[PDB]
Amino acid sequence: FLKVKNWETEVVLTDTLHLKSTLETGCTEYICMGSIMHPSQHARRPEDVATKDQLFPLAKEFIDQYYSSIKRFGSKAHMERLEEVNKEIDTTSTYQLKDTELIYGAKHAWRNASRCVGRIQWSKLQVFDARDCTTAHGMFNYICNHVKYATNKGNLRSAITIFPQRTDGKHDFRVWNSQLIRYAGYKQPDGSTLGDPANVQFTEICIQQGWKPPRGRFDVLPLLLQANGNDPELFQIPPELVLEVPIRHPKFEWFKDLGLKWYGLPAVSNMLLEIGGLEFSACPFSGWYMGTEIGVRDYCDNSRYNILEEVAKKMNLDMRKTSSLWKDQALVEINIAVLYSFQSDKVTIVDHHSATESFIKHMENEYRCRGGCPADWVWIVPPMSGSITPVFHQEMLNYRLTPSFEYQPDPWNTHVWK
């Protein structure tokens, strides 16, 4: 047993779920790696060509968990499923999930994502089975339908589309984009950057693949889709599917003249979904934004759009010294505008006060029914106004449960072209 305490309310919770932890965190009793971005390379099966004694134990564990989840441990269907997975592995070196197992696994990977403040929503996830896909054109069709369903004219719905699992590591399906909808970034001749600097490398690959860049500040990037290990292919998302929000301020009339906008649907497309030893290398998932992601990180990181200096100018703030807090003052105003703008256009968004409150409630729920909730304080606490949100004062235990979402390498570092 391990207790976590909220230092604002004095609520103490007791964690037993961590006893089911599978993978190393990176920490030891002598060193804590809680702020390392990727602390551990402890995986569940070697790189590929997993033998029977390597894959079957992972499959048995997942099937066991699913059938226990539904109160059917030891049932005929459970025992039948085990022998079924045994035969498939024997005859194909892999196995295939039932539709129910796939949905269960995708929801539990989200439920297990310790870095995610949005998991109160975890069991409301629309799962699109795209395991019949064979080509980049088919991937594009599946993605377009995902975007259209999830956007829902601004009433955003959480969804995930699951493309065929990895077989041998040479026939991977991959979305080369980091998100389905991102803005381009361009290296200027003098040395500055136009657009989004995070995406300069990916933009150059698109350009180097034939994409004609409009060379603007908010150029929706094309999709670069790889099916069955083949060379990736470019597709333009139909603009009527890409919902965008112009950013204005409820007090500063001049704010709109900064020419800022952002897109409504965040859709992460470069993670790997791991279920029962199976690896889904293309599994784009989407929900909706917390305001700070755009207002604090996308707009105000120094290596991102870096707009703090410009906003502070128009606000006529004393920018001579840091102690005037001109950065902090402009940062607030920017995040007010982002929220006001989304809310004005009826595009789903959550502020960091409401999101963190919801997450404290989700923590309650999880400790009550499940005996714990893995949570990464470093990621859960919002990047502004940390201590006036409830999660700042909440102790959290972090451990790794399966199914899960994992990082994976950018495919241009590993793909051999044709």
Ligand X SMILES: N=C(Nc1ccc(CCNCc2cccc(NC(=N)c3cccs3)c2)cc1)c1cccs1
Ligand Y SMILES: C[C@H](O)[C@H](O)[C@H]1CNc2nc(N)[nH]c(=O)c2N1
Q: Which sequence positions are flagged as catalytic? A: 116, 119, 288, 293
Binding residues vs ligand Y (CB under 6 A): 7, 35, 37, 378-379, 392-395
Dihedral angle of Cα 274, 280, 284, 285, to the nearest 10 degrees? -30
How far is CA 191 from each of CA 111, 187, 301, 310, rounded to the nearest angstrom? Answer: 43, 7, 18, 19
Q: How far is the CB of 116 from ligand X (least distance, A)?
A: 7
Question: At 220, phi and psi to the nearest 5?
Answer: -60, 125
User: Which stretch, 7-15, 110-118, 236-244, 310-318, contacts ligand HEM (CB under 6 A)?
Assistant: 110-118
Q: How far is the CB of 39 from Zn ion (least distance, A)?
A: 8
Q: How far is the CB of 92 from ligand X (least distance, A)?
A: 32
Q: How far is the CB of 4 from Zn ion (least distance, A)?
A: 14
d(CA 384, CA 379): 12
Is residue 371 a contact point for Zn ion (CB under 5 A)?
no
The tokens for 34 are 């809680």
List the beta bridge partners of residue 186: 194
Hey, which residues between 1 and 30 contact a second copy (CB under 8 A)? 2, 4-5, 7-8, 18, 21-30
Is residue 383 a contact point for Zn ion (CB under 5 A)?
no
Distance of alpha carbon 269 from the chain centroid: 8
Is residue 408 a contact point for ligand HEM (CB under 6 A)?
no
Is residue 173 a contact point for ligand HEM (CB under 6 A)?
no
Taking phi over 0 as left and psi of -120 to 50 as alpha, with beta for the rest, 42 belongs to beta
User: Which stretch, 105-113, 231-239, 255-263, 388-396, contacts a second copy (CB under 8 A)?
Assistant: 388-396
d(CA 250, CA 234): 39
How far is CA 252 from each of CA 216, 249, 258, 330, 337, rounded to the nearest angstrom? Answer: 25, 5, 11, 12, 9
Binding interface with ligand X (CB under 6 A): 197-198, 266-268, 285-287, 289-290, 293, 301, 303-304
Binding interface with ligand HEM (CB under 6 A): 110, 113, 115-118, 121, 125, 158, 160, 285, 287-288, 290, 293, 350, 355, 379, 405
